[PDB]
Write a protein that binds this ligand. Sequence first.
Ligand SMILES: [Zn+2]
Ligand SMILES: [Zn+2]
Lengths: 69, 95, 72, 54, 120, 79, 100
Amino acid sequence: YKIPDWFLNRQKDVKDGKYSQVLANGLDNKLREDLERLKKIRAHRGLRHFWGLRVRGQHTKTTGRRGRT
Amino acid sequence: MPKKNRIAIYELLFKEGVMVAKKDVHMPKHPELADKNVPNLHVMKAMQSLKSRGYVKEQFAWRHFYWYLTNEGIQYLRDYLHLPPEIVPATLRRS
Amino acid sequence: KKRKKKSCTTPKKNKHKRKKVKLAVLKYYKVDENGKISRLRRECPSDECGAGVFMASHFDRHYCGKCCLTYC
Amino acid sequence: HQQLYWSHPRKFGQGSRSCRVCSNRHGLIRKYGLNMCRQCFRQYAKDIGFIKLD
Amino acid sequence: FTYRGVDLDQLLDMSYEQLMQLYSARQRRRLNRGLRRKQHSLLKRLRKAKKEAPPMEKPEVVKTHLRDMIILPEMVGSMVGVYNGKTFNQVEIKPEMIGHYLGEFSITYKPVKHGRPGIG
Amino acid sequence: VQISKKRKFVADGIFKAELNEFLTRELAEDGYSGVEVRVTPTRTEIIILATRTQNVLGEKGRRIRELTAVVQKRFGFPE
Amino acid sequence: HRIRITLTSRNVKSLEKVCADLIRGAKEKNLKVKGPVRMPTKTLRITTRKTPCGEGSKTWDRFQMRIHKRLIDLHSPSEIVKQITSISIEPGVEVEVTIA
RNA sequence: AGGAGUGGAGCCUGCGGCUUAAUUUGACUCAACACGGGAAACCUCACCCGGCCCGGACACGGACAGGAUUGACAGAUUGAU
RNA sequence: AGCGUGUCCUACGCCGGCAGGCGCGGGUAACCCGUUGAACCCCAUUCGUGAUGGGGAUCGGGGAUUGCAAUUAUU
Ligand SMILES: [Zn+2]
Ligand SMILES: [Zn+2]
């Protein structure tokens, strides 16, 4: 229906490279795969997601003290 | 230090009675000694040697060395470069 | 801070000492009793040091020290 | 060694600028091309022509 | 395995100047700017250790300091020791790594386990 | 291609600040007390005020002929 | 034919004395002049921390320099132009002449 | 007398602590704590793990032009041409 | 609007949703950006007391720039 490609929520997918908009039951079914990729392939950011610490390179000295006892 | 570089440095200081350099050991060419490919480090370390023997006096200010020939320097570079005794630095020829 | 003196390394590196070869000019020219000479070292065809500078007779290549030119 | 002695790039950043008086690399005034550090400008300001008015 | 719907069989055949349409923007830009001598010398070393190895056996480690290196398909199967600052850590190139950098897979710090609070 | 006047009026005070420092470390033991710069279009004059005027030029004037040659090399004056 | 004389200084007293002398000389000879027009003052500001070590009560020095400009226009040959300027010389005044 | 607040929340930045190979360092009431122009990817950089260079003047003694010394291709080695 | 900067500050035209790209021009400046068309302000619309279209932390995919190098996300 002539909707441009830059408007979706997964544009150039890693595994199949298709421009698709994922929705309620699929949007969370393509996030767990994204994190499992980086946990199985031991990337730094996948280990951060594993330990529960922060991901985008933040200052953890002062902020973020909720959840931690 | 190549002998050609050492000669070039010594016979430039002889025409004047003075020498100027910048404290910059990574400058690849001394501006007064261009087209001879004499680095700035070599000038610094040659005037360091001539000072220790007493033939020149230095003055440092704001990253710059200013060296002057002494009466024992004209007497010593005249024999090193085999110059005729009818050669005198430009400082000694006026007034 | 405070100085901590850790000098431990895989022993100590040794600086390359050059070998003192006596009269290396001899081996370049073969001189008989008749006066004629033979040039035992192959020579480099260059401009910086041609006509007098001999190359290196290695086991698989000829090499000029000044030119850094290698013929295999 | 000649290939790698002073071979890191020095085109930008604090590692490429320094005081024109004392060669320090911290607190430099680049404005108007003064190129004097924070503490050397308070020493030569009157000589340069700066006046404290207000 | 497949990258954007293209598997390793053709990825090894894809032209270096043609991989820039499968990577993301950062690595497309780096490939466009160019790989330098230190990158080519590491690729050449990884190639030599791959060819001069038994067929059914892993290659020999090629250690490098270059943490900022794109992991090309030509690197797949290599045994690489990445320097974290003090020690070289052994990292093997798994296919799904063909996007990331090398230094991401050798952590430069120790995970923090806290002890008894002291003065404060 | 010339320079902005903001940068020109500044660069004329940085030049005069280093010349005073250089002459201070050079002629202090001879009564150095100040310098003045007169930019005549043909010839740039530099007046040095001092107590012992004989110890500034020196015998035969062999000292102020050294200064006038070491200053132009530093500051890129034409001969 | 048009001769633009630009004056620039930091001491307004000296600069105005020079400008008045030039205008008076041009009146003294048979010349037509365009009066001194004053460009906006140029104020250069450097603000610095007083301390060399960042310890005290965070005081600041406010430094500044002021540049004064004028413009004068003449309709005369360069021979006539180059007498009055050579008569009056003052330190700190940057006299510039442009022929059209 | 009042106004806007701070102290509560999320985050950004500095101090302790705790970790760390190192998480370089100065400053601790007003008169330390977005201060050291201190917003550090490299440089800055001091800190940590490694690896080249001397840029050790000058004086004296030794060896040495039947050479004091200097630099260098390739194989190996090396993070590295 | 006002105080300031500018040999990096940029007008004009074309492709881009945009961030952003290509070709000509001006300015060492009351001369060009620039008559500096700033934001709150102001006038119409939708929303309707609710953890709500308030508020934006956090995180996943893409794209583009600075740089030799952006992976412990530079922006
Ligand atoms: Zn040769
Ligand atoms: Zn300084």
